[PDB]
RNA sequence: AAAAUGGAGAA
RNA sequence: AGCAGAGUGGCGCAGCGGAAGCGUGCUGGGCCCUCAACCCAGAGGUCGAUGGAUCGAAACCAUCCUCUGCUACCA
RNA sequence: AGCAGAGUGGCGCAGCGGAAGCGUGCUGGGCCCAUAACCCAGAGGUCGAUGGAUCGAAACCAUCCUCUGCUACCA
RNA sequence: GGGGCAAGAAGACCCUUUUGAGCUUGACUCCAGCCCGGGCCUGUGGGGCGGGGCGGCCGGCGCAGCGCACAGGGGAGGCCGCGCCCCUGAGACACCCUGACGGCCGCCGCCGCCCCGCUCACCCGGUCGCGCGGGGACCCGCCCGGGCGGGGAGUUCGGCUGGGGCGGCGCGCCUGCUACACCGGACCGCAGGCGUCCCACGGCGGGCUCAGCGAGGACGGAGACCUCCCGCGGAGCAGAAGGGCACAAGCCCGCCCGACCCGCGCCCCCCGUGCCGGCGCGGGCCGCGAAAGCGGGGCCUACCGAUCCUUCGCCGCCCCGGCCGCGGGCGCGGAGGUGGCAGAAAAGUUACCACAGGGAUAACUGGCUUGUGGCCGCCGAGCGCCCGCAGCGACGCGGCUUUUUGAUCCUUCGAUGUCGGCUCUUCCUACCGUCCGCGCGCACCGGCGCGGAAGCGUCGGAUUGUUCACCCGUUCAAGGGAUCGUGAGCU
RNA sequence: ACAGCGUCGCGAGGGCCGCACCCGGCGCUGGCGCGACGUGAUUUCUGCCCAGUGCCACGACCGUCACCGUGAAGCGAUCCGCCGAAGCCCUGGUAAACGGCGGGAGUAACUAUGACUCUCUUAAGGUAGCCAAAUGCCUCGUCGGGCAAUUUCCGACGUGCAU
RNA sequence: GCGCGUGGGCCCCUCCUGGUAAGCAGGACGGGCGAGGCGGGACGAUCCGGACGCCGGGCCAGGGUGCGCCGCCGGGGCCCG
RNA sequence: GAGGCCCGCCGCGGUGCUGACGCGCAGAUCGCUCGUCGGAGCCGGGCAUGGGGGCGAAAGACUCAUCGAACCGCCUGGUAGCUGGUUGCCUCCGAAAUGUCUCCCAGGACAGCCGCCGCCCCGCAGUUGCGGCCCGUAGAGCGCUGGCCGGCGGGAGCGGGGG
RNA sequence: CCACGCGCCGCGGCGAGCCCGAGGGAGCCCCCGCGGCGGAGCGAGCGCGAGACGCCCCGGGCCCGCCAUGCCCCUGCGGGCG
């Protein structure tokens, strides 16, 4: 699938349709100050090995891709979840 | 699993040396002031047999330098030594079989036995039947002498270290076939409980890592790493190469 | 340095 | 049982939607002093049958015949 | 996940900004009295893709697909 | 010793249990051990090598114009005399400037690293400490950090299922059927799909007509293009299947992004709970169109995912004695998943084996069945010189039996001793020989068919555990049943 | 089990074990030794293969790969560089290490046949022997011997499921 | 409102699916047994009648009426249940 | 006068009969028949080694009738969706073996059925009639989708044979 | 069977209240005796905060909190009204 480089959609700050440039959202690096990292790091310390479940039986083949639409003037970031697809390209302008 | 035979052996207890009726510790005479300067004269009172040693031993009686009696030393006997020989242990000792002199004094190419790994260690290398070490070279600046151990490996030992001139007696003892299992039992009874030997592929899975299946097979390669764990090192440890070959 | 080969028997 | 492959000149073995192909046999023609080779011709096919499927099928597809390899769950 | 590397004629395999190499296969010249070697040509590579940056890119730098190596694993 | 499925014994086989244990390994998670690094233990002196920073200095080769133009410079004077601006490329370079990449320094009170001693820590040997050594700031030890590590622990090893395994997945979902005209209906029933693809294959407006017949028109025929004509869709609309569709939902254009935002409700499955999917609105913002309208993607029915955690957006609150900056948290809702799809984190083996149970469930006996195995009958195409029937009988048809194996799972798992032989009894007839008839393609002899007939006979041996098989032999040798008769009868 | 036969490690500032630690055993030992393993007297031999998996390199340091230490930034928590020990990777060695030892073509002049050179997988293709064997599915193999008659037996034969 | 048992069912009638079939497996409406006494079907869990406090008399269902064994005759037709 | 030499007594083993026994003489004995009988021999006493440990000429054998992990006490009246049992009488009512989820399939939850406790007042039905709407099965049919068996009558072009 | 926790039912006392808590009273069946719970909810929180009816039951209407949106204004990211 391909996604338009720019789209017109409602920017919540403006309250009206605006041109939104499009980029691909990525999950960011996990922080060590988050409350779950902090609880898992504490739990893991010591003897007894792995204390939390590790998921292994992966069946999914694709991830629903999230497109960051950043508004040209407001800077409002809105996102659209495209239906599961193997390949996504954001077309150049 | 079960502790394997190697693990059970290190606690002694049945695998301890059968040391009863052994004459004593065969050792070179202690270094003394008269050994360091001049030579002490001893007489070979007897040449006897140690229970677990193939090489004959020898009771040499030296005079007591410290006091007024006579002191008896037990020495591994070089071939050719006889009862009523005069053996000199000293820095000024002649190069005759039996005499103990420091390795710097000993000339290069001389067959020596009961060599000291470090000075005043009273005996260490070349103590088994037939075995000998040879003087290779002396570095007089480093006060060190190269010797070739019976293995072939060359060791730099202090020129101060002492050695008995000669080749240990009992030479060519392993040339004769044991022939019977019974002759083996008699040799090992004078040593330690190490015989008879059951192959690990004969034992059940618990007893040995080679263990057992429907057919007797080593399973994985016999070669084991040098960093194996204490109950895992069982086949060929750290083998550089395996197999029969030329040379 | 390398440099094998060459149906039948008839003159 | 059921499973896969094939069936094409006389022998083989290809082909594989548009011919039948190469070797051998199989004669012939060269070739030489003659012979062996060798070369080159000439010919050889219900393509195992049938139905479908096509403008057209050896081919692709169904049916069937024949061979040829694979086959039975301890209690 | 991360850090690194690879992808070149039919095939193997060089090649760092300024050509498209060499081996093999093939096709022929030559070679020899005739072979076999041998020698020499000729043709053969969106230089995985895609976009950029560059006087200009197989190369550089991203991407995207495979492949490798080592390390990673709160879902 | 036939029977009391005689007594032993909560089947050991088999299966089930979210019951074990022994063993294994590249199962999941680990642990001693050991290797390696750095720190501490731990003194006293040297020597070298880098780094970093300064800092001079030497270099830079695709060619017209001036020769190899490293680069970004600056500029009609610096100090050349050349300059320039010329005369030039991809960019001119004069005196002075830095900037990158190299080389050659030197420098430093900076920071690492390695090496060589020394003896006092430490560390071993020798001696009856009797007239001695060997190491050495290392090693060990210890604290951290990284490796190896079934040697050793702990645990796990899905489900469904005409027993279980193997093999499939009706284990989440969809179409037509099964399904018996509301709805609902089962199967390891039938014929098939789904885990994706498309910023256009989407929204909207306009216009259009599709597949084809038929007849025509250079190459041109089966086949491409162009015309009329008639064309109810016989085409297309991403993919299964069924519906649906014609001035359209197909096709082609032109414009666009509603494939938005915020709040709800409902229908399907249904406990009337989720979830996917749809649908109906109240607003905000848009697009298309002249407008009316229509639009929350793809005509409809499939194409997907809890809590916890993470990551990101939006607007605010809180950190509890204040306040400020950072950071953390929280309400809101997306994404990163649990396909075994209402969602443990998980490999084998066991004949060394268990445990609790199960005839909910296999092996074994009986019982139902009879495909298969036997064993008959009907028809009469043909065979039999001729001649359908002396003897045969195809092609079909209708039965029977339980002496074959299946199919099944009714009975038995707090136990019905499971093959064969040996021994011994009895029974059956679907009769091989003998008896009595009768028919022959019955001259005799011998065969062959058929009806009644179960009294007697159906043996001895070689190989195999064999039942069976196969061969030898005789006075020439049927087939079976009795818990596959027969183990407190045996072997 | 065994004698024999190999293979392996190891020179004591060691190896292999024990071991909560303190400390031990082999060791009153010393390579004709000790520990670890295979195979299992003779007689005669032991082929090929280092791809895979082990094992080993004073064999390199390639890529990775930690604390620490060292820079840079910060208000600081911190973060980002650098540094990079073993190990692995990389390169060699090693089968009396574990193990493996197959196919496809072309190849006359009975015509099969390859004896020769050529490929593929994945490194090599089963050599000397041996055989329907305690190892052969088909199988109660085939051909001899022995018997009156033999799923046994003995001698042969051998694409030998699967020596 | 509170809560219990249950969540192995199996038969009959008719309608069905797979299977050669099965006292086989899987479904549907109603009924039954389960959990329903009793009389009959010789015997039987489910069939045919009847569904139950304890009794006395009366009626009579279903199924029968030689004798075991309660209760039968009459008529027409057929005839090796 | 040599030998892990042979025959053979005691001894020490334990082969076969698959003998006796099998409510025994005996929780492994008995009788014959055997293996060996100068040796890796047999036997006594002392001592050493201890439970995931020991010891093992290896059989998972042996460790006091116990060994693929001894025994004793305790944690422990371990846990069991799995078996067995669960104790007076009468009366009144009276099921379910199905729907959905679940590592679920020998179990449970939630619904249904069912009992008890009531509470409140407004009309109720497994029925027929009458009216309105729906449905695509039996049958019937071949227009649709897929089959099918042949006759007859025409020819534009065909596909073969004829002239 | 007993303890303890929770649900619901009945019953007794008292009622916007209610309560042998531990304890203390030369007193233990007598007297005196706190929390607690209920009486106000809702929101993650900052916080804000219920009257309109009615035998009873059910429903509608309306008020309070949470969330949005207008409008007005003080002591103003605050108050009022919708």
mmCIF file of N, CA, C and O (backbone and C1' of nucleotides) in Angstrom, chain F residues 357-380:
data_model
loop_
_atom_site.group_PDB
_atom_site.id
_atom_site.type_symbol
_atom_site.label_atom_id
_atom_site.label_comp_id
_atom_site.label_asym_id
_atom_site.label_seq_id
_atom_site.Cartn_x
_atom_site.Cartn_y
_atom_site.Cartn_z
ATOM 1 P P G F 357 -8.209 -45.161 43.737
ATOM 2 O "O5'" G F 357 -8.421 -45.490 42.182
ATOM 3 C "C5'" G F 357 -9.758 -45.698 41.687
ATOM 4 C "C4'" G F 357 -9.981 -44.794 40.503
ATOM 5 C "C3'" G F 357 -10.625 -45.428 39.271
ATOM 6 O "O3'" G F 357 -12.039 -45.481 39.412
ATOM 7 C "C1'" G F 357 -8.788 -44.105 38.610
ATOM 8 P P G F 358 -12.916 -46.676 38.761
ATOM 9 O "O5'" G F 358 -12.842 -46.422 37.175
ATOM 10 C "C5'" G F 358 -13.434 -45.221 36.624
ATOM 11 C "C4'" G F 358 -13.114 -45.163 35.153
ATOM 12 C "C3'" G F 358 -13.584 -46.366 34.336
ATOM 13 O "O3'" G F 358 -14.944 -46.191 33.966
ATOM 14 C "C1'" G F 358 -11.322 -45.855 33.809
ATOM 15 P P G F 359 -16.032 -47.200 34.520
ATOM 16 O "O5'" G F 359 -15.317 -48.635 34.359
ATOM 17 C "C5'" G F 359 -16.022 -49.716 33.711
ATOM 18 C "C4'" G F 359 -15.759 -49.654 32.228
ATOM 19 C "C3'" G F 359 -16.840 -50.276 31.338
ATOM 20 O "O3'" G F 359 -16.937 -49.558 30.119
ATOM 21 C "C1'" G F 359 -14.794 -51.259 30.855
ATOM 22 P P A F 360 -18.035 -48.386 29.876
ATOM 23 O "O5'" A F 360 -17.314 -47.098 30.470
ATOM 24 C "C5'" A F 360 -16.156 -46.548 29.827
ATOM 25 C "C4'" A F 360 -16.545 -45.274 29.131
ATOM 26 C "C3'" A F 360 -15.410 -44.508 28.454
ATOM 27 O "O3'" A F 360 -15.938 -43.883 27.282
ATOM 28 C "C1'" A F 360 -16.478 -43.114 30.005
ATOM 29 P P U F 361 -15.967 -44.617 25.831
ATOM 30 O "O5'" U F 361 -14.430 -44.850 25.488
ATOM 31 C "C5'" U F 361 -14.035 -45.520 24.273
ATOM 32 C "C4'" U F 361 -12.916 -46.502 24.537
ATOM 33 C "C3'" U F 361 -13.268 -47.692 25.427
ATOM 34 O "O3'" U F 361 -12.518 -48.875 25.146
ATOM 35 C "C1'" U F 361 -11.505 -46.483 26.403
ATOM 36 P P A F 362 -12.705 -49.778 23.790
ATOM 37 O "O5'" A F 362 -11.468 -49.318 22.905
ATOM 38 C "C5'" A F 362 -11.147 -49.998 21.691
ATOM 39 C "C4'" A F 362 -9.662 -50.213 21.615
ATOM 40 C "C3'" A F 362 -9.197 -51.649 21.776
ATOM 41 O "O3'" A F 362 -9.372 -52.371 20.572
ATOM 42 C "C1'" A F 362 -7.831 -50.243 23.076
ATOM 43 P P A F 363 -9.979 -53.832 20.625
ATOM 44 O "O5'" A F 363 -8.691 -54.737 20.852
ATOM 45 C "C5'" A F 363 -7.514 -54.575 20.045
ATOM 46 C "C4'" A F 363 -6.362 -55.294 20.693
ATOM 47 C "C3'" A F 363 -6.688 -56.658 21.289
ATOM 48 O "O3'" A F 363 -6.770 -57.731 20.357
ATOM 49 C "C1'" A F 363 -5.490 -55.416 22.868
ATOM 50 P P C F 364 -8.201 -58.311 19.944
ATOM 51 O "O5'" C F 364 -8.111 -59.859 20.314
ATOM 52 C "C5'" C F 364 -7.076 -60.380 21.170
ATOM 53 C "C4'" C F 364 -7.672 -61.037 22.393
ATOM 54 C "C3'" C F 364 -9.149 -61.391 22.327
ATOM 55 O "O3'" C F 364 -9.428 -62.597 21.619
ATOM 56 C "C1'" C F 364 -8.601 -60.478 24.459
ATOM 57 P P U F 365 -10.662 -62.724 20.537
ATOM 58 O "O5'" U F 365 -11.764 -63.548 21.336
ATOM 59 C "C5'" U F 365 -11.385 -64.515 22.327
ATOM 60 C "C4'" U F 365 -12.528 -64.766 23.274
ATOM 61 C "C3'" U F 365 -13.911 -64.611 22.681
ATOM 62 O "O3'" U F 365 -14.296 -65.779 21.976
ATOM 63 C "C1'" U F 365 -13.835 -63.635 24.844
ATOM 64 P P G F 366 -15.207 -65.651 20.684
ATOM 65 O "O5'" G F 366 -16.591 -65.049 21.234
ATOM 66 C "C5'" G F 366 -17.733 -65.925 21.352
ATOM 67 C "C4'" G F 366 -18.730 -65.309 22.299
ATOM 68 C "C3'" G F 366 -19.749 -64.348 21.688
ATOM 69 O "O3'" G F 366 -20.838 -64.997 21.052
ATOM 70 C "C1'" G F 366 -18.850 -63.386 23.627
ATOM 71 P P G F 367 -21.162 -64.662 19.536
ATOM 72 O "O5'" G F 367 -22.598 -63.941 19.584
ATOM 73 C "C5'" G F 367 -23.296 -63.841 20.847
ATOM 74 C "C4'" G F 367 -23.806 -62.434 21.022
ATOM 75 C "C3'" G F 367 -24.066 -61.653 19.736
ATOM 76 O "O3'" G F 367 -25.272 -62.027 19.076
ATOM 77 C "C1'" G F 367 -22.950 -60.278 21.273
ATOM 78 P P C F 368 -25.369 -62.043 17.459
ATOM 79 O "O5'" C F 368 -25.493 -60.505 17.079
ATOM 80 C "C5'" C F 368 -26.730 -59.801 17.249
ATOM 81 C "C4'" C F 368 -26.566 -58.388 16.762
ATOM 82 C "C3'" C F 368 -26.159 -58.237 15.309
ATOM 83 O "O3'" C F 368 -27.258 -58.361 14.418
ATOM 84 C "C1'" C F 368 -24.831 -56.814 16.644
ATOM 85 P P U F 369 -27.227 -59.373 13.142
ATOM 86 O "O5'" U F 369 -26.308 -58.617 12.087
ATOM 87 C "C5'" U F 369 -26.697 -57.343 11.552
ATOM 88 C "C4'" U F 369 -25.482 -56.635 11.018
ATOM 89 C "C3'" U F 369 -24.753 -57.351 9.900
ATOM 90 O "O3'" U F 369 -25.316 -57.016 8.643
ATOM 91 C "C1'" U F 369 -23.201 -56.491 11.477
ATOM 92 P P U F 370 -25.865 -58.158 7.685
ATOM 93 O "O5'" U F 370 -24.967 -57.997 6.382
ATOM 94 C "C5'" U F 370 -23.962 -56.972 6.295
ATOM 95 C "C4'" U F 370 -22.625 -57.564 5.917
ATOM 96 C "C3'" U F 370 -22.657 -58.785 4.998
ATOM 97 O "O3'" U F 370 -21.582 -58.624 4.074
ATOM 98 C "C1'" U F 370 -21.256 -59.206 6.814
ATOM 99 P P G F 371 -21.828 -58.354 2.504
ATOM 100 O "O5'" G F 371 -20.554 -57.482 2.077
ATOM 101 C "C5'" G F 371 -20.772 -56.182 1.493
ATOM 102 C "C4'" G F 371 -19.462 -55.442 1.453
ATOM 103 C "C3'" G F 371 -18.224 -56.285 1.138
ATOM 104 O "O3'" G F 371 -17.962 -56.361 -0.256
ATOM 105 C "C1'" G F 371 -17.844 -55.032 3.112
ATOM 106 P P U F 372 -17.639 -57.774 -0.987
ATOM 107 O "O5'" U F 372 -16.333 -58.320 -0.257
ATOM 108 C "C5'" U F 372 -15.043 -57.712 -0.403
ATOM 109 C "C4'" U F 372 -14.107 -58.324 0.606
ATOM 110 C "C3'" U F 372 -14.076 -59.842 0.615
ATOM 111 O "O3'" U F 372 -13.286 -60.444 -0.397
ATOM 112 C "C1'" U F 372 -14.322 -59.092 2.821
ATOM 113 P P G F 373 -13.856 -61.709 -1.165
ATOM 114 O "O5'" G F 373 -13.657 -62.923 -0.128
ATOM 115 C "C5'" G F 373 -12.328 -63.212 0.370
ATOM 116 C "C4'" G F 373 -12.436 -64.180 1.520
ATOM 117 C "C3'" G F 373 -13.238 -65.449 1.242
ATOM 118 O "O3'" G F 373 -12.460 -66.388 0.519
ATOM 119 C "C1'" G F 373 -13.861 -64.562 3.334
ATOM 120 P P G F 374 -12.994 -67.101 -0.839
ATOM 121 O "O5'" G F 374 -13.392 -68.577 -0.356
ATOM 122 C "C5'" G F 374 -14.780 -68.958 -0.418
ATOM 123 C "C4'" G F 374 -15.167 -69.625 0.876
ATOM 124 C "C3'" G F 374 -16.489 -70.396 0.840
ATOM 125 O "O3'" G F 374 -16.279 -71.764 0.529
ATOM 126 C "C1'" G F 374 -16.588 -68.787 2.541
ATOM 127 P P C F 375 -16.645 -72.404 -0.928
ATOM 128 O "O5'" C F 375 -17.840 -73.403 -0.591
ATOM 129 C "C5'" C F 375 -18.383 -73.485 0.738
ATOM 130 C "C4'" C F 375 -19.863 -73.215 0.705
ATOM 131 C "C3'" C F 375 -20.512 -73.274 -0.663
ATOM 132 O "O3'" C F 375 -20.722 -74.597 -1.130
ATOM 133 C "C1'" C F 375 -21.389 -71.458 0.574
ATOM 134 P P C F 376 -21.091 -74.943 -2.690
ATOM 135 O "O5'" C F 376 -22.683 -74.986 -2.676
ATOM 136 C "C5'" C F 376 -23.444 -74.171 -3.579
ATOM 137 C "C4'" C F 376 -24.797 -73.839 -2.994
ATOM 138 C "C3'" C F 376 -25.830 -73.419 -4.024
ATOM 139 O "O3'" C F 376 -26.506 -74.520 -4.607
ATOM 140 C "C1'" C F 376 -25.718 -71.765 -2.358
ATOM 141 P P G F 377 -26.669 -74.569 -6.181
ATOM 142 O "O5'" G F 377 -27.909 -73.604 -6.470
ATOM 143 C "C5'" G F 377 -29.217 -74.017 -6.023
ATOM 144 C "C4'" G F 377 -30.110 -72.807 -6.005
ATOM 145 C "C3'" G F 377 -30.391 -72.166 -7.362
ATOM 146 O "O3'" G F 377 -31.404 -72.829 -8.105
ATOM 147 C "C1'" G F 377 -29.816 -70.499 -5.822
ATOM 148 P P C F 378 -31.240 -72.991 -9.676
ATOM 149 O "O5'" C F 378 -31.824 -71.625 -10.247
ATOM 150 C "C5'" C F 378 -33.142 -71.169 -9.908
ATOM 151 C "C4'" C F 378 -33.310 -69.745 -10.366
ATOM 152 C "C3'" C F 378 -32.952 -69.480 -11.816
ATOM 153 O "O3'" C F 378 -33.991 -69.824 -12.719
ATOM 154 C "C1'" C F 378 -31.961 -67.827 -10.458
ATOM 155 P P C F 379 -33.655 -70.723 -13.989
ATOM 156 O "O5'" C F 379 -33.265 -69.654 -15.096
ATOM 157 C "C5'" C F 379 -34.172 -68.603 -15.451
ATOM 158 C "C4'" C F 379 -33.391 -67.457 -16.030
ATOM 159 C "C3'" C F 379 -32.555 -67.783 -17.251
ATOM 160 O "O3'" C F 379 -33.324 -67.753 -18.446
ATOM 161 C "C1'" C F 379 -31.324 -66.414 -15.747
ATOM 162 P P G F 380 -33.601 -69.105 -19.252
ATOM 163 O "O5'" G F 380 -32.562 -69.062 -20.482
ATOM 164 C "C5'" G F 380 -32.287 -67.802 -21.135
ATOM 165 C "C4'" G F 380 -30.795 -67.608 -21.252
ATOM 166 C "C3'" G F 380 -30.051 -68.572 -22.189
ATOM 167 O "O3'" G F 380 -29.121 -67.884 -23.023
ATOM 168 C "C1'" G F 380 -29.085 -68.625 -20.029
#
